[PDB]
Design a protein around this motif. Structure first.
Motif, PDB file in Angstrom:
ATOM      1  N   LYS A 158      -1.905   2.598  -4.156  1.00 21.05           N
ATOM      2  CA  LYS A 158      -2.910   1.540  -4.121  1.00 21.05           C
ATOM      3  C   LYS A 158      -2.631   0.566  -2.987  1.00 21.05           C
ATOM      4  O   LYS A 158      -3.561   0.061  -2.348  1.00 21.05           O
ATOM      5  CB  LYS A 158      -2.953   0.808  -5.463  1.00 21.05           C
ATOM      6  CG  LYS A 158      -3.987  -0.307  -5.538  1.00 21.05           C
ATOM      7  CD  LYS A 158      -4.196  -0.773  -6.973  1.00 21.05           C
ATOM      8  CE  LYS A 158      -2.971  -1.500  -7.510  1.00 21.05           C
ATOM      9  NZ  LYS A 158      -3.267  -2.915  -7.871  1.00 21.05           N
ATOM     10  N   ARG A 159      -1.352   0.298  -2.717  1.00 19.65           N
ATOM     11  CA  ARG A 159      -0.999  -0.589  -1.617  1.00 19.65           C
ATOM     12  C   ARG A 159      -1.261   0.074  -0.272  1.00 19.65           C
ATOM     13  O   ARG A 159      -1.683  -0.592   0.678  1.00 19.65           O
ATOM     14  CB  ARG A 159       0.463  -1.021  -1.735  1.00 19.65           C
ATOM     15  CG  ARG A 159       0.726  -1.939  -2.913  1.00 19.65           C
ATOM     16  CD  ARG A 159       1.815  -2.953  -2.625  1.00 19.65           C
ATOM     17  NE  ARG A 159       1.776  -4.050  -3.587  1.00 19.65           N
ATOM     18  CZ  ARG A 159       2.846  -4.709  -4.024  1.00 19.65           C
ATOM     19  NH1 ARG A 159       4.057  -4.392  -3.581  1.00 19.65           N
ATOM     20  NH2 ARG A 159       2.702  -5.694  -4.899  1.00 19.65           N
ATOM     21  N   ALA A 160      -1.100   1.374  -0.167  1.00 18.26           N
ATOM     22  CA  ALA A 160      -1.359   1.997   1.119  1.00 18.26           C
ATOM     23  C   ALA A 160      -2.819   2.390   1.310  1.00 18.26           C
ATOM     24  O   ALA A 160      -3.193   2.856   2.369  1.00 18.26           O
ATOM     25  CB  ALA A 160      -0.459   3.199   1.308  1.00 18.26           C
ATOM     26  N   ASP A 161      -3.602   2.182   0.268  1.00 18.25           N
ATOM     27  CA  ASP A 161      -5.008   2.489   0.288  1.00 18.25           C
ATOM     28  C   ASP A 161      -5.718   1.386   1.016  1.00 18.25           C
ATOM     29  O   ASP A 161      -6.230   0.470   0.400  1.00 18.25           O
ATOM     30  CB  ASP A 161      -5.540   2.551  -1.132  1.00 18.25           C
ATOM     31  CG  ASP A 161      -6.587   3.600  -1.303  1.00 18.25           C
ATOM     32  OD1 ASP A 161      -7.659   3.452  -0.695  1.00 18.25           O
ATOM     33  OD2 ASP A 161      -6.341   4.574  -2.036  1.00 18.25           O
ATOM     34  N   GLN A 175       8.825   5.407 -12.412  1.00 19.28           N
ATOM     35  CA  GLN A 175       8.630   6.132 -11.161  1.00 19.28           C
ATOM     36  C   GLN A 175       7.164   6.499 -10.958  1.00 19.28           C
ATOM     37  O   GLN A 175       6.640   6.396  -9.842  1.00 19.28           O
ATOM     38  CB  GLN A 175       9.508   7.384 -11.141  1.00 19.28           C
ATOM     39  N   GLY A 176       6.483   6.915 -12.028  1.00 19.27           N
ATOM     40  CA  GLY A 176       5.071   7.236 -11.912  1.00 19.27           C
ATOM     41  C   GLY A 176       4.213   6.015 -11.644  1.00 19.27           C
ATOM     42  O   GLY A 176       3.220   6.091 -10.915  1.00 19.27           O
ATOM     43  N   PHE A 177       4.580   4.873 -12.226  1.00 15.42           N
ATOM     44  CA  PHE A 177       3.834   3.644 -11.977  1.00 15.42           C
ATOM     45  C   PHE A 177       3.997   3.184 -10.532  1.00 15.42           C
ATOM     46  O   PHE A 177       3.016   2.809  -9.878  1.00 15.42           O
ATOM     47  CB  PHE A 177       4.289   2.555 -12.950  1.00 15.42           C
ATOM     48  CG  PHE A 177       3.955   1.156 -12.505  1.00 15.42           C
ATOM     49  CD1 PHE A 177       2.653   0.686 -12.569  1.00 15.42           C
ATOM     50  CD2 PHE A 177       4.946   0.307 -12.035  1.00 15.42           C
ATOM     51  CE1 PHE A 177       2.341  -0.600 -12.167  1.00 15.42           C
ATOM     52  CE2 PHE A 177       4.643  -0.980 -11.630  1.00 15.42           C
ATOM     53  CZ  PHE A 177       3.338  -1.433 -11.696  1.00 15.42           C
ATOM     54  N   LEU A 178       5.227   3.220 -10.015  1.00 15.94           N
ATOM     55  CA  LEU A 178       5.480   2.727  -8.665  1.00 15.94           C
ATOM     56  C   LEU A 178       4.733   3.550  -7.625  1.00 15.94           C
ATOM     57  O   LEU A 178       4.225   3.002  -6.639  1.00 15.94           O
ATOM     58  CB  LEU A 178       6.983   2.728  -8.385  1.00 15.94           C
ATOM     59  CG  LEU A 178       7.773   1.704  -9.201  1.00 15.94           C
ATOM     60  CD1 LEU A 178       9.264   1.787  -8.902  1.00 15.94           C
ATOM     61  CD2 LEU A 178       7.243   0.304  -8.925  1.00 15.94           C
ATOM     62  N   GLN A 179       4.645   4.867  -7.834  1.00 15.99           N
ATOM     63  CA  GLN A 179       3.939   5.725  -6.887  1.00 15.99           C
ATOM     64  C   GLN A 179       2.450   5.398  -6.851  1.00 15.99           C
ATOM     65  O   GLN A 179       1.840   5.362  -5.775  1.00 15.99           O
ATOM     66  CB  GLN A 179       4.163   7.194  -7.248  1.00 15.99           C
ATOM     67  N   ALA A 180       1.845   5.155  -8.017  1.00 15.81           N
ATOM     68  CA  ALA A 180       0.442   4.754  -8.047  1.00 15.81           C
ATOM     69  C   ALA A 180       0.250   3.366  -7.447  1.00 15.81           C
ATOM     70  O   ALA A 180      -0.759   3.107  -6.782  1.00 15.81           O
ATOM     71  CB  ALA A 180      -0.088   4.798  -9.479  1.00 15.81           C
ATOM     72  N   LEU A 181       1.202   2.459  -7.670  1.00 19.05           N
ATOM     73  CA  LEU A 181       1.111   1.137  -7.058  1.00 19.05           C
ATOM     74  C   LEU A 181       1.288   1.221  -5.546  1.00 19.05           C
ATOM     75  O   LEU A 181       0.577   0.546  -4.793  1.00 19.05           O
ATOM     76  CB  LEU A 181       2.150   0.197  -7.670  1.00 19.05           C
ATOM     77  CG  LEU A 181       2.339  -1.150  -6.963  1.00 19.05           C
ATOM     78  CD1 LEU A 181       1.020  -1.895  -6.850  1.00 19.05           C
ATOM     79  CD2 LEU A 181       3.378  -2.006  -7.677  1.00 19.05           C
ATOM     80  N   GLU A 182       2.231   2.047  -5.085  1.00 21.71           N
ATOM     81  CA  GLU A 182       2.399   2.238  -3.649  1.00 21.71           C
ATOM     82  C   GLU A 182       1.154   2.861  -3.029  1.00 21.71           C
ATOM     83  O   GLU A 182       0.721   2.447  -1.946  1.00 21.71           O
ATOM     84  CB  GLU A 182       3.630   3.101  -3.372  1.00 21.71           C
ATOM     85  CG  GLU A 182       3.993   3.201  -1.898  1.00 21.71           C
ATOM     86  CD  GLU A 182       3.953   1.858  -1.191  1.00 21.71           C
ATOM     87  OE1 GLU A 182       4.754   0.969  -1.553  1.00 21.71           O
ATOM     88  OE2 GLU A 182       3.118   1.692  -0.277  1.00 21.71           O
ATOM     89  N   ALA A 188      -1.647  -4.485  12.380  1.00 18.37           N
ATOM     90  CA  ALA A 188      -0.237  -4.671  12.712  1.00 18.37           C
ATOM     91  C   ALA A 188       0.657  -3.803  11.836  1.00 18.37           C
ATOM     92  O   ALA A 188       1.443  -2.994  12.342  1.00 18.37           O
ATOM     93  CB  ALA A 188       0.144  -6.148  12.593  1.00 18.37           C
ATOM     94  N   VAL A 189       0.554  -3.960  10.511  1.00 20.44           N
ATOM     95  CA  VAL A 189       1.413  -3.199   9.609  1.00 20.44           C
ATOM     96  C   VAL A 189       1.134  -1.709   9.734  1.00 20.44           C
ATOM     97  O   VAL A 189       2.050  -0.882   9.644  1.00 20.44           O
ATOM     98  CB  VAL A 189       1.246  -3.686   8.158  1.00 20.44           C
ATOM     99  CG1 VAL A 189       2.407  -3.197   7.299  1.00 20.44           C
ATOM    100  CG2 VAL A 189       1.152  -5.202   8.119  1.00 20.44           C
ATOM    101  N   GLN A 190      -0.135  -1.344   9.949  1.00 19.98           N
ATOM    102  CA  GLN A 190      -0.492   0.064  10.084  1.00 19.98           C
ATOM    103  C   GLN A 190       0.229   0.703  11.263  1.00 19.98           C
ATOM    104  O   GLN A 190       0.834   1.773  11.132  1.00 19.98           O
ATOM    105  CB  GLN A 190      -2.009   0.201  10.239  1.00 19.98           C
ATOM    106  CG  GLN A 190      -2.569   1.522   9.750  1.00 19.98           C
ATOM    107  CD  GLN A 190      -2.243   1.787   8.294  1.00 19.98           C
ATOM    108  OE1 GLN A 190      -2.517   0.962   7.423  1.00 19.98           O
ATOM    109  NE2 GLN A 190      -1.653   2.946   8.023  1.00 19.98           N
ATOM    110  N   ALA A 191       0.186   0.050  12.426  1.00 14.68           N
ATOM    111  CA  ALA A 191       0.795   0.620  13.623  1.00 14.68           C
ATOM    112  C   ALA A 191       2.312   0.736  13.482  1.00 14.68           C
ATOM    113  O   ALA A 191       2.895   1.787  13.773  1.00 14.68           O
ATOM    114  CB  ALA A 191       0.429  -0.226  14.844  1.00 14.68           C
ATOM    115  N   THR A 192       2.966  -0.333  13.026  1.00 13.37           N
ATOM    116  CA  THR A 192       4.422  -0.407  13.021  1.00 13.37           C
ATOM    117  C   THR A 192       5.058   0.140  11.751  1.00 13.37           C
ATOM    118  O   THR A 192       6.286   0.112  11.636  1.00 13.37           O
ATOM    119  CB  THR A 192       4.881  -1.850  13.229  1.00 13.37           C
ATOM    120  OG1 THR A 192       4.414  -2.662  12.145  1.00 13.37           O
ATOM    121  CG2 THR A 192       4.339  -2.384  14.549  1.00 13.37           C
ATOM    122  N   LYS A 193       4.269   0.614  10.792  1.00 13.58           N
ATOM    123  CA  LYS A 193       4.847   1.412   9.725  1.00 13.58           C
ATOM    124  C   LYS A 193       5.473   2.666  10.327  1.00 13.58           C
ATOM    125  O   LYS A 193       5.114   3.103  11.426  1.00 13.58           O
ATOM    126  CB  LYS A 193       3.786   1.779   8.688  1.00 13.58           C
TER     127      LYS A 193
END
Ligand SMILES: CC(C)=CCC/C(C)=C\CC/C(C)=C/CSP(=O)(O)OP(=O)(O)O
Ligand SMILES: CC(C)=CCC/C(C)=C\CC/C(C)=C/CSP(=O)(O)OP(=O)(O)O
Ligand SMILES: C=C(C)CCOP(=O)(O)OP(=O)(O)O
Ligand SMILES: C=C(C)CCOP(=O)(O)OP(=O)(O)O
Ligand SMILES: [Mg+2]
Ligand SMILES: [Mg+2]
Lengths: 201, 327, 327, 201
Positions: free
Chosen positions: C320-323, C311-318, C138-143
């Motif tokens: 990891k979340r999109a992984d 900013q560097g932490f959030l990008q790695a967390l994002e 669901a989230v994959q398609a509607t992203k």
């Protein structure tokens, strides 16, 4: 060996004057967005070359104080060019001071705080602070007072440059330090050499 | 032999005055009245006559100032260094001052007419006792007068004035009126001899010398400096006009520099105070910040207690200054 | 069986909508969809039918929101606490979610038509693996879809979300991406499941309960809270309208309180940073203030280096979340 | 001895309810220029009289936190009136907390900083921070969560009151704390006593 000749000529120029300043102040009343460190550094190098012992660089905005490293870098650059880095570095730091407004009134207030602290510790008396003792107390210490100030730019004011120390400083004004020439610098020295100091007599 | 001629401005002087008065005008001008002796030699007259003419020009220049709406003037009349001149010349200057000051007293009540306040600033204990008494009577009579202000700097140097101001603040902490931490640029300002007047808008020195000779060094740090070649007894309205023209040209950048200095000082003071409050809060174990607004009330009380001590010190210093049995 | 009915507003609904849209409108409304089981008992129908009707009301309420220009909605659909219900009821809810989500996939491309972004927030590893796969698709398609946003809170509690956000920041310092001193309210905000949406303007709970039941506790600290007695499957446009009316009445004081909180926080942060810079300047022996503006550039570099690490932490967390190989 | 009767009546009132809050929060959404400490103090005294163990006083502007002494002074005043100062003072400080916004989100951030500091010292693991461990770490410690909040004033918001701790707090709203009566306070208690808590089941 051509650098030895240049040093000889500048030494002869300084020696030829009726008198030379021991301590010169350079007061820049208008510093541009990109400061002209090369023009300031040349003024400093000329002073040291002609035989002036101390040079104080000053601007009211403290730009040279907040760019002290770039300034000395350019001074050392031009000191080698057309004229053992540690000895050269040490000698410029001994001879060259970069000042801002806080070196004037704020330092006198510092000295007053220090002396009044001794009064509060029963270690000195209010009558102990005379003219000569206060002068000793300032952070000028044994350094001689400026005898000549070259003031550059359009402001007809010392703008807070060492008020205590300029009681007898000759103040010579030039329009701009930008692209300043040795002849213009030396003409200012001739003006100071010809001045008459009577000391109240 | 009076302190101010009564002449009105001529047509061209009056016209040029109206023009510049459309712009910013100085409220306080200081004069270094230099060149009297060279003037005497140039006119082949005695040195005493050069100084007497110098006084006449002071009287005339004050009238110009008044006609220009410039209501406060400070003049350099005698340096402590001038005590090193010959007894013949020093006696001549002391005699001139004795004769002008008493004469001010004979011409008194006319000072009440034009509201003229006369102040004499310097280390006056070095003067002859008789001259101190004449001078003391002067400030006593013309105190409480409002329309204009003349500050005569006699037996004065700036270093001696700054040293005395520090001694005054040191006397304050010796009496429990001040903490050494209360000492500030503003407080030293309020201990100078000139503490009743604003800093000069213009400092003028005649005769072509480009030095200050120990005059108002603290007060003129941001003043427009005018070095004019004319010898003092030959000063004209147009020399004064030119100096004001200089002031108007500098005024924009100078007031900006003045304000930036003041904004930087007040600000550095705020940071020192915040740091001190922080140090007291690093100790005692409390927090650096919180909803309780602790550092805010500590900052409020720090300054208010400082201002209270300062106000109390100045009143005792003013009372000591007005405590005079010398008149 | 679809996620949003297609009905337009009636005359009176449309008229009242135009009126309130002259004032401030919420951009994000959160719903606690409470009362399904009491509704089922009241209508003498099975609990599964109460929940199915509850989903139908969600679809209808989203259409109202869209018709009101309210383009982001967050709903409480399943609490971690609800795992404590009977297997019969839990299986019924999981079956309903399985049937609505797949059906979203059959009704896909129509989501591309209305730019509908679907996000499902919670501790999703507690769900059946099949349901995770349907949700993940669901989230994959509607992203990458923009026109509106629905956040479904499934297997969610606020404490579990806040705990996870702290664990995320702790993972940051374990990886060298963060210093423990970088942890801040703003950073925790950006580690929540809801980190892609603004805090809700309104939190609505139906059925007359006046509790939050572990829903969006961080995000709704300054949200306008609306407790309405209607049971969720009986929610009407006028209940939604009344909640918005509540929001408009509170808006002035609430936005003032929101801004004052933010101004106080940013300010207390400035004082902590100034105090830290002072401590580094108490050490090293340098001054607390000076013309060199030392503490100013130290303050600039302190925050800039903090912002760079963040900013560097959030990008790695994002990342990891999109992984996700879960879709 | 009439104070013993009043204590008996209030004890009976609290005991008569189906349930009593162990920890009550009083959220004032509108504090006036001159704060009404007497109305707040009466609410606090009534809570303690009916048998409520903990009372948290809260306003978004931190006025009660910055006037903590005046508040406790008024509480102790009304605790003696119509109801060994050190024991009375100690018991009120144990039972009464004065809170501001920083006790909510800022304290959770404090706990996160403390825990991440242990992670950086290789002393704890990121997976070590679960829901129960974080709750232990907050400065609430063993104190129970608020089970009832009385919200006074016109703002329909908790305004940052202990967000972590109010996951299941019943939030009962009254229009004003000003000249609040015991009957109005107790009616709020009756509402909480009659509420049904299902805990997700
Ligand atoms: C206050 C009062 C009533 C009288 C005193 C004021 C008067 C009349 C004269 C000032 C005395 C001096 C030393 C002036 C400096 S010019 P100079 O002597 O330095 O001459 P020079 O520069 O050598 O040419
Ligand atoms: C996201 C999706 C596709 C489906 C799930 C959303 C739906 C349809 C229902 C939510 C389930 C629950 C527990 C709602 C709370 S009402 P309650 O059960 O607590 O009833 P009560 O308060 O006891 O009357
Ligand atoms: C009363 C006055 C004007 C004293 C300053 O002038 P001086 O003549 O004494 O200063 P110098 O040139 O000697 O330094
Ligand atoms: C999906 C939802 C709406 C969970 C919250 O409602 P609950 O019914 O589970 O909350 P309680 O009344 O039991 O506290
Ligand atoms: Mg002279
Ligand atoms: Mg329910």
């Amino acid at each position: 060996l051509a650098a030895a000749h240049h040093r000889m000529r500048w030494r002869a120029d300084g020696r030829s004057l009726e008198k030379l300043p021991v301590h010169m102040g350079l007061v820049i009343t208008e510093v541009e967005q990109e400061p002209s460190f090369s023009d300031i550094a040349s003024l400093v190098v000329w002073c040291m070359a002609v035989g002036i012992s101390y040079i104080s660089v000053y601007d009211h905005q403290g730009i040279f104080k907040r760019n002290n490293s770039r300034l000395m870098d350019e001074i050392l650059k031009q000191q080698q060019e057309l004229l053992d880095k540690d000895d050269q570095v040490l000698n410029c730091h001994l001879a060259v001071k970069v000042l801002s407004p806080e070196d004037g009134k704020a330092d006198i207030v510092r000295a007053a705080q220090d002396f009044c602290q001794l009064v509060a510790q029963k270690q000195k008396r209010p009558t102990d602070l005379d003219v000569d003792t206060l002068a000793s107390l300032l952070s000028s210490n044994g350094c001689p007072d400026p005898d000549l100030v070259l003031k550059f730019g359009p402001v007809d004011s010392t703008l807070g440059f060492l008020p205590w120390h300029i009681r007898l400083t000759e103040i010579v004004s030039l329009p701009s330090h930008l692209n300043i020439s040795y002849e213009d610098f030396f003409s200012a020295l001739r003006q100071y050499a010809a001045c008459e100091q009577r000391l109240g007599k | 032999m009076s302190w101010i001629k009564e002449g009105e401005l001529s047509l061209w002087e009056r016209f040029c005055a109206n023009i510049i008065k459309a712009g910013p005008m100085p409220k306080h001008i200081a004069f270094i009245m230099d060149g009297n002796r060279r003037y005497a030699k140039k006119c082949q007259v005695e040195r005493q006559e050069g100084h007497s003419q110098g006084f006449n020009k002071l009287a005339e220049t004050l009238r110009w100032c008044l006609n220009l709406g410039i209501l406060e003037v400070t003049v350099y009349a005698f340096s402590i260094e001038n005590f090193k001149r010959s007894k013949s010349e020093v006696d001549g200057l002391m005699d001139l001052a004795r004769q002008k000051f008493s004469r001010l007293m004979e011409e008194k009540e006319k000072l009440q007419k034009h509201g003229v306040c006369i102040r004499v600033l310097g280390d006056l204990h070095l003067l002859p006792l008789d001259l101190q008494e004449l001078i003391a009577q002067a400030v006593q009579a013309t105190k409480n007068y409002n329309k204009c202000f003349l500050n005569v700097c006699f037996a004065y140097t700036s270093r001696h004035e700054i040293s005395n101001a520090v001694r005054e603040m040191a006397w304050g902490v010796e009496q429990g009126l001040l903490d050494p931490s209360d000492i500030s640029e503003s407080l030293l300002d309020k201990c100078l001899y000139t503490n009743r007047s604003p800093h000069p808008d213009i400092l003028i020195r005649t005769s072509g010398e480009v030095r200050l000779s120990d005059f108002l060094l603290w007060q003129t740090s941001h003043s427009c400096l005018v070095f004019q070649p004319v010898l003092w007894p030959e000063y004209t309205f147009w020399n004064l006009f030119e100096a004001i023209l200089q002031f108007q040209m500098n005024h924009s950048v100078l007031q900006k520099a003045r304000d930036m200095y003041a904004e930087e000082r007040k600000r550095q003071q705020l940071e020192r105070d915040q740091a001190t409050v922080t140090e007291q809060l690093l100790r005692e174990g409390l927090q650096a910040s919180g909803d309780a607004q602790l550092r805010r009330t500590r900052l409020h009380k720090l300054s208010a207690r400082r201002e209270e001590r300062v106000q109390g010190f100045l009143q005792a210093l003013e009372l000591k200054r007005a405590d005079w049995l010398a008149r």
